[PDB]
Design a protein around this nucleic acid. Structure first.
Ligand SMILES: [Zn+2]
Lengths: 67, 357
DNA sequence: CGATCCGGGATCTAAACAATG
DNA sequence: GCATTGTTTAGATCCCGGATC
């Protein structure tokens, strides 16, 4: 499995904590709202997620020579 | 597997572009200043070698440029029973053939004409000052004028005689490519002229040097650039053949080995022609595109090694165009160098050719 | 000539790929 | 399996030297 880019690392938690409070059964609408939210965060609000994705590929790129 | 080794052999696009630029600039001016009623007036350019055949490796620093002469009505007398070296005689007296000043008696001076040829070149390379040019000394035997441009880019120029007459008796059973390519292609290919280049090195007493060597370098270029049993092999991504890739790595194998033994030792004195001729017989016995699938890169390579190994193991590799002529004849190479060569490859083959990296 | 078109190194565009009910 | 954003590559386009008439 290709490592999780900063969007997926951020999208796994928010979709859950939204679908609990929101009553939308479809994930198509919920994902549209997540992309709406990720496109509105500040670069400082997104930097730690980039650091996390770098640490993800840190032990997936030099431990698995496949891409 | 070894597919990554090719990336360390691809010529830089800017390297070939700048190198061929200065090479063309010297060649055209040299060719332009040539052909001034020295019977050279009809010299033509013939592009041969590992570059124009798209098998050049490492860096593009060497070129194989051939100058041809359309000398007509030539009668050839076979030298001894060599089946490859020939006297250039003239069929009839009346026409006053252009190279008549180079006629000794009834044989053509392969030495006087070649020295005159180098004379015209050495005169005019000095005059041009656009590019630094140094003429390498004629190497003992070498029939070629080796020019050295500034910072490598060596150019090997071989004066050749074009003969639009039919091929010889020696080539009658050669070019056995009927199941491969076509029997129709062979006829189409045989009608094309054959060329005459001065003999490359000493053999025998060292005199009677008026012998000439047959050259089918243009033939090797055509079948390499149209190499598939089906006409569209390599036209599309589907069914891309590995043919060129096999003798490419083969040339890198031997090229790599010659450098390795830089002790002025053995395994020397045989060029890529043995690799190219061996790969030629490989494609003969493998006349199907299915056998040369791209996925089986290591397999078709291994089959090409196998035939080279067997050519070594049998100690006989005949010229493709001339069957009797043996490039692995006992006179040409001692059996120990084949023992030398087979020792390496077999080690390198099982141990994955460690000299590549 | 030069007009054209092919082969191959160079470079681009596109779709597939990751987590998720 | 839907719809998002980012990364990665391969399937494709571009570009140029050679070549034949
Ligand atoms: Zn092919």
């Amino acid at each position: 499995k290709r490592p999780m880019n900063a969007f997926i690392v951020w999208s796994r938690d928010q979709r859950r904590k939204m679908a609990l409070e929101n009553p939308r059964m479809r994930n198509s609408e919920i994902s549209k709202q997540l992309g709406y939210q990720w496109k509105m965060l500040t670069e400082a609000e997104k930097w730690p997620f980039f650091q996390e994705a770098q640490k993800l590929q840190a032990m997936h790129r030099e431990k698995y020579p496949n891409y | 597997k070894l597919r990554a080794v090719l990336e360390k052999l691809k010529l830089s696009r800017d390297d070939i572009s700048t190198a061929a630029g200065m090479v063309k600039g010297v060649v055209d001016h040299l060719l332009l200043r040539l052909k001034c009623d020295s019977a050279f007036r009809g010299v033509g350019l013939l592009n041969t070698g590992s570059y124009y055949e798209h098998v050049k490796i490492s860096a593009p620093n060497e070129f194989d440029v051939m100058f041809k002469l359309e000398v007509p009505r030539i009668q050839l007398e076979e030298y001894s029973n060599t089946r490859a070296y020939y006297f250039v005689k003239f069929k009839r007296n009346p026409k006053e053939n252009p190279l008549s000043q180079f006629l000794e008696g009834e044989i053509l001076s392969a030495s006087k004409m070649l020295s005159k040829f180098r004379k015209i070149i050495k005169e005019e390379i000095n005059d041009i000052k656009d590019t630094d040019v140094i003429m390498k000394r004629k190497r003992g035997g070498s029939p070629a004028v080796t020019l050295l441009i500034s910072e490598k880019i060596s150019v090997d120029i071989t004066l050749a005689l074009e003969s639009k007459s039919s091929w010889p008796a020696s080539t009658q059973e050669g070019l056995r490519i009927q199941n491969w390519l076509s029997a129709k292609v062979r006829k189409q290919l045989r009608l094309k002229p054959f060329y005459l280049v001065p003999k490359h090195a000493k053999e025998g007493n060292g005199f009677q040097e008026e012998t000439w060597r047959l050259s089918f370098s243009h033939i090797e270029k055509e079948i390499l650039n149209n190499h598939g049993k089906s006409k569209t092999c390599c036209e599309n991504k589907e069914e891309k053949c590995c043919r060129k890739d096999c003798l490419k790595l083969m040339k890198y194998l031997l090229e790599q080995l010659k450098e390795r033994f830089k002790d002025k030792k053995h395994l020397d004195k045989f060029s890529s022609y043995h690799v190219k001729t061996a790969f030629f017989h490989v494609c003969t016995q493998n006349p199907q595109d299915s056998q040369w699938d791209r996925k089986d890169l290591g397999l078709c390579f291994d089959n090409c090694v196998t035939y080279f190994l067997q050519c070594l193991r049998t100690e006989k590799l005949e010229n493709y165009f001339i069957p009797e002529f043996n490039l692995f004849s006992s006179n040409l190479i001692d059996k120990r160098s084949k023992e030398f060569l087979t020792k390496q490859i077999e080690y390198e083959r099982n141990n994955e050719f460690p000299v590549f990296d």
